[PDB]
Structure 1
Amino acid sequence: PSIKLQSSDGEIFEVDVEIAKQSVTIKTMLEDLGMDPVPLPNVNAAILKKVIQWCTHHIPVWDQEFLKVDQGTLFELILAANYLDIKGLLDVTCKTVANMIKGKTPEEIRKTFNIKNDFTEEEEAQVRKEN
């Protein structure tokens, strides 16, 4: 085979079928709707690349570094993973945000993701109370 999925951008990435078919989302648009090019209005050209560059290659080894990129593009992958329904890619990109919360303190978590503290003293106290 060989279908052309078409990013939000116009840009036409070419992939073998089955490289894609792991997106149940791209799957359906062939397997159910007989759609010629696969239009991804929710994924970017830049983003498409990085997910095809994952769906080719298929506690990570190779992924640990594939995902050492900034939140705003990590995030971006999480929803794209979710949009193209790629069970793995959504799992290991969440795992990653988890690994970044894991390990001590609400203050460290903030610093990690920014995030001002909303709670008054009271609200802070009756959370520390169910400690």
Structure 2
Amino acid sequence: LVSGEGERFTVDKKIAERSLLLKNYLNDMHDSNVPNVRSSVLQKVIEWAEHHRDSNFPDEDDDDSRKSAPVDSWDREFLKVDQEMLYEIILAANYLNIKPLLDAGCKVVAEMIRGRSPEEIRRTFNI
């Protein structure tokens, strides 16, 4: 439920049910019956889940949605904190099968890389 490298957190909550992996691996259906994620990025993911605890997403049933839309500004600033850690945050959101964080991370990193091209550098950095 928490990374072994000194990682701990709330064992379960409405937030932890946000991860579709934990929808089955969090003792879900206990009557009928995390290792990989790095500690810091685990903290970051649970922070995002807690923040959006009071939100709703169309999940994979968004069809035309789930993409081709601007990302939430708070998510933009929250994820835009480290270039090297964003890829492993995307990987964590992938392993936990959490679609919204995956989509947000991909949007943010795509815009970072697009904005690092020399044309965009000159058009937005110095000009």
The size of the alignment, in residue pairs, is 100
Unaligned runs of 5+ in 2: 53-70, 121-127
2:7 aligned residue: 11
Please give the root-mean-square deviation of Cα atoms over the aligned residues, in Å. Answer: 2.6
Matched residues in 2 for 1:76 and 1:86: separation?
14
Greater per-residue helix proportion: 2
1:119 aligned residue: none
Please point out which of 46, 49, 60 is paired with 1:55.
49
What is the TM-score of this pair, normalised by structure 1? 0.64
The list of structure 1 runs, each at least 4 consecutive aligned residues, that deviate by more than 4 angstroms after superposition, is none
Does the CA contact (< 8 Å) of 1:67 and 1:93 recur in 2? yes
Deviations 1:80-99 (A, max 9, x none): 00011110000000011221
2:40 aligned residue: 46
**Greater Cα radius of gyration, structure 1 or 2:** 1
Please point out which of 67, 84, 87 is paired with 2:79.
67
Greater per-residue strand proportion: 1
| More contact order relative to length (CA 8 Å, sep ≥ 6) | 2
- What is the deviation of 1:103? 5.9
The percentage of counterpart residues that share the same residue type is: 53
Does the CA contact (< 8 Å) of 1:81 and 1:89 recur in 2? yes
Structure 1 position 90 matched with structure 2 position 102: yes
Unaligned runs of 5+ in 1: 35-39, 110-131
What is the TM-score of this pair, normalised by structure 2? 0.66
**Residues 1:64 and 1:104: Cα distance change in structure 2 (over 3 Å):** closer
Does the CA contact (< 8 Å) of 1:8 and 1:42 recur in 2? no
